[PDB]
C-alpha cells in the first residue's frame, strides 16, 4: 500500500485505480463505477484482502510479477516511483452499463440475477453483470470500522450482493435447457418435422407426478405438433416425451459436449461447475429434459451454450483478460483465443439457430434490421417450486446469420404468468444488451 498499484481497465476506461493519499497506507484504491463493475474488479481491502481480478491479477497489479521485476528493480535503483502493471479486460463498458441499467429498471424496480455477454468467435467476456451489487469503495476504506461494518452489512444481507451471480451461482435453466434436449435429439437423428405430443399434461413414468405445459394449454389444436413447432412454442410435454425418447445417456453426453459436468477453466476468475445431474430414473429424465430436477447452470454457462451455437458448434474458451501490461504500458502478455471443444456439428448448430430464430419471433426491444436467435423460459426452484415465483431466463445471439454477441439473462423470481413462455421480463433486458453490443 506503499507503492502505486496498477489499473484494471475496460474499453480504455478505468475500472479500478489507486491514488496517492496522506494515509499511513499511502495508496487508496478507487472504483469509479463501483456497483456496476464489482463482479469484474472485486475489492482490494486492508483487512479483507482481495477478490475477483484484484485477487487473480494481484502480482501484476502490485508489481511483484516475475515478468515485471526488471522494472521495479530499475525503479529502486534510479529513484523513480514504482508502479504496478495494468490489466486490460475484455469488458465493453457500453455493454456492461446497458446490462446493469436494464437489470436496475427491468423488474418494475431493480432485478436480482445476472447478465453475461460473450463474443462467440473469440470467447471474449463483454459483460459480466450481477444484481444486486455492492460498492468496493467501502472495503477499500482505510478505516478499520468502515470496512468491518460494510463487511457485516453485506454478509448479513439476505440478497447476498457480494455474490457474483454470473459465475459463482448455479440455477435451474428450465425451458432454456430444451436447447440441449433438442441438440441431443437432432444428433441422435431426430428431425424438426417429426411429430410429438401436443397434450396439455403428460404422466412421468414410474411416478405419480405429471408435468404440464405452461398455462395448462395444449401445444396446438392438433393431436401432435412438429418438433420445430414444439420448440418455438416451448411446449413442455413434447420435450418430456422427446427427452425420454432420446435417453439419459444421450442427454448427459450432449450436456457434457456443451460444457456441463466439466470443471470450468479459469477466466482467470473461477466459474462454478454446471451439471445435468445424475438422472437416477426416467421421472428425473422427464424433468431434466425441460431443465428441472438436478440441472444447474451458471448464467455464463447458459451464455456459452448460445455462443457455441452462434459460432457454428465450436465453443471458444471464455476469457476476461485481453492483455497484461507494465507500468509504462509495454506488453507483458496478450490472451490468444482457443477453440475449447466442438459441441455439435455445423449442421446441428444451423438447425438450432433456425429454431431459435423461430422462437425469438414468437417482441419488446426488438432491433430494426437485426435478426435475433433466442430462447426464453422460466425455471422452478427451491424446496417449494410449485408456489415460489420461477426464474426468468433469456439466452440469445445476434445477428443470427453472422453473430457478434451472445447473451444470457437470468432474472431471479422474474417469471411471468401471462406471456407465451412466462420468461418475458428477461427478454427486453437481453435485447438492450444486444443493441448496446451492435451499436
Q: 3-state SS string over the chain?
A: CCCECCCEEECCEEEEEEEECCCCCCEEEECCCHHHHHHHHCCEECCCEECHHHHHCHHHHCCCCCCCHHHHHHHHHHCCCCECCEEEECCCHHHHHHHHHHHHHCCCCCCCEEEEEECCCCCEEEEEEEECCCCHHHHCCCCHHHHHHHHHHHHHCCCCCCCCCCCCCCECCHHHHHHHHHHHHHHCCCCCCCEEECCCEEECCCCCCEEECHHHCCCCCCCEEEHHHHHHHCCHHHHHHHHHHHCHHHHHHHHHHCCCCCCCCCCCCCCCCCECCCCCCHHHHHHHCCCCCCCEECHHHHHHHHHHHHCCCEEECCECEEEEECCCCCEEEECCCCEEEECCCHHHHHHHHHHHHHHHHCCCCCCCCCCCEEEEEEECCCCCCCCCCCEEEEEEEECCCCCCEEEEEEECCCCCCCCCCCCCCHHHHHHHHHHHHHC
Q: CATH assignment of 1-89+135-157+320-334?
A: 3.90.1310.10
The technique is: X-ray
One fold for both 1-89+135-157+320-334 and 90-131+170-319+338-439? no
Q: Is 105 left (phi over 0), alpha (psi -120 to 50) or beta?
A: alpha
Separation CA 271–CA 267 (nearest Å):
8
242 C-beta neighbours (distance < 10 Å), count:
23
CA atoms within 13 A on the CB side of 95: 29
| Range 159-173 burial, b when 16+ CB lie within 10 A, else e | ebbbbbbbbbbbbbb
What's domain 90-131+170-319+338-439's architecture? Answer: 3-Layer(aba) Sandwich (3.40)
- Rounded to 5°, angle at Cα 39 from 158 and 54: 120
Q: How many residues in total does the chain contain?
A: 439
* Positions marked active-site: 175
What is the torsional sign of CA 308, 312, 316, 321? Answer: negative
Separation CA 152–CA 154 (nearest Å):
6
341 C-beta neighbours (distance < 10 Å), count:
16
402 C-beta neighbours (distance < 10 Å), count:
10
Across the strands, what pairs with 414? none
Report the candidate in 410, 416, 419 with the shortest Cα–Cα distance to residue 389. 416
- Domain residue ranges of the chain, discontinuous segments joined by +: 1-89+135-157+320-334, 90-131+170-319+338-439
Separation CA 382–CA 60 (nearest Å):
41
The resolution of the experimental structure, rounded to one decimal in Å, is 2.0
Separation CA 285–CA 251 (nearest Å):
9
**Radius of gyration of the chain, Cα coordinates, nearest whole angstrom:** 23
Separation CA 34–CA 284 (nearest Å):
42
Report the candidate in 339, 358, 365 with the shortest Cα–Cα distance to residue 182. 358
CA atoms within 13 A on the CB side of 363: 10
Separation CA 293–CA 212 (nearest Å):
15
Amino acid at each position: 500500500y506503499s507503492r502505486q498499484r496498477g489499473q484494471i481497465t475496460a474499453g480504455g476506461q478505468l475500472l479500478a485505480y489507486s491514488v496517492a493519499t496522506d494515509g499511513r497506507f499511502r495508496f487508496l484504491r478507487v472504483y469509479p463505477n463501483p456497483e456496476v463493475y464489482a463482479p469484474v474488479t472485486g475489492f482490494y481491502s486492508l483487512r479483507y484482502s482481495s477478490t475477483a481480478l484484484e485477487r487473480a491479477e494481484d502480482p501484476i497489479l502490485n508489481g511483484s510479477d516475475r515478468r515485471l521485476f526488471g522494472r521495479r528493480l530499475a525503479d529502486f535503483f534510479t529513484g523513480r516511483d514504482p508502479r504496478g502493471g495494468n490489466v486490460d479486460t475484455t469488458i465493453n463498458p457500453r455493454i456492461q452499463q446497458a446490462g446493469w441499467d436494464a437489470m436496475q429498471q427491468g423488474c418494475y424496480g431493480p432485478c436480482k440475477g445476472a447478465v453475461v455477454a460473450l463474443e462467440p468467435s473469440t470467447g471474449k467476456i463483454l459483460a459480466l453483470v450481477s444484481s444486486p451489487s455492492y460498492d468496493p469503495n467501502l472495503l477499500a476504506s482505510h478505516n478499520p470500522e468502515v470496512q468491518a461494518q460494510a463487511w457485516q452489512r453485506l454478509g448479513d444481507n439476505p440478497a447476498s450482493p457480494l455474490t457474483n451471480r454470473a459465475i459463482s451461482e448455479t440455477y435451474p435453466p428450465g425451458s432454456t435447457f430444451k436447447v440441449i434436449t433438442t441438440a441431443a435429439a437432432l444428433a441422435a437423428g431426430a428431425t424438426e418435422t417429426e411429430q410429438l405430443t401436443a397434450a396439455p399434461t403428460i404422466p412421468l413414468p414410474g411416478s405419480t407426478a405429471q408435468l404440464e405445459n405452461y398455462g395448462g394449454a395444449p401445444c396446438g389444436d392438433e393431436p401432435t405438433v412438429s418438433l420445430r413447432e414444439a420448440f418455438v412454442k416451448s411446449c413442455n410435454t413434447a420435450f418430456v416425451q422427446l427427452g425420454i425418447r432420446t435417453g439419459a445417456d444421450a442427454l448427459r453426453s450432449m450436456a457434457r459436449a456443451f460444457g456441463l459436468d466439466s470443471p470450468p477453466r479459469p477466466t482467470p476468475l473461477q466459474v462454478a461447475e454446471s451439471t445435468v445431474g445424475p438422472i437416477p430414473d426416467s421421472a428425473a429424465l422427464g424433468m431434466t429434459s425441460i431443465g428441472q430436477k438436478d440441472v444447474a447452470l451458471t448464467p455464463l454457462a447458459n451464455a456459452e451454450i448460445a455462443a457455441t451455437i452462434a459460432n457454428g458448434g465450436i465453443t471458444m474458451r471464455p476469457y476476461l483478460v485481453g492483455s497484461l501490461k507494465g507500468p509504462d504500458l509495454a506488453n507483458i502478455s496478450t490472451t490468444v483465443r482457443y477453440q475449447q471443444r466442438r459441441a455439435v456439428s455445423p449442421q446441428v448448430a444451423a438447425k438450432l439457430t433456425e429454431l431459435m430464430v423461430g422462437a425469438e419471433k414468437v417482441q419488446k426491444g426488438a432491433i430494426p434490421g437485426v435478426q435475433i436467435a433466442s430462447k426464453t423460459g422460466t425455471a422452478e426452484h427451491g424446496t417449494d417450486p410449485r408456489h415460489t415465483p420461477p426464474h426468468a431466463w433469456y439466452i440469445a445471439f445476434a445477428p443470427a446469420q453472422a453473430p457478434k454477441v451472445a447473451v444470457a439473462v437470468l432474472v431471479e423470481n422474474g417469471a411471468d404468468r401471462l406471456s407465451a413462455t412466462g420468461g418475458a421480463l428477461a427478454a427486453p433486458i437481453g435485447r438492450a444488451v444486444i443493441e448496446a453490443a451492435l451499436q
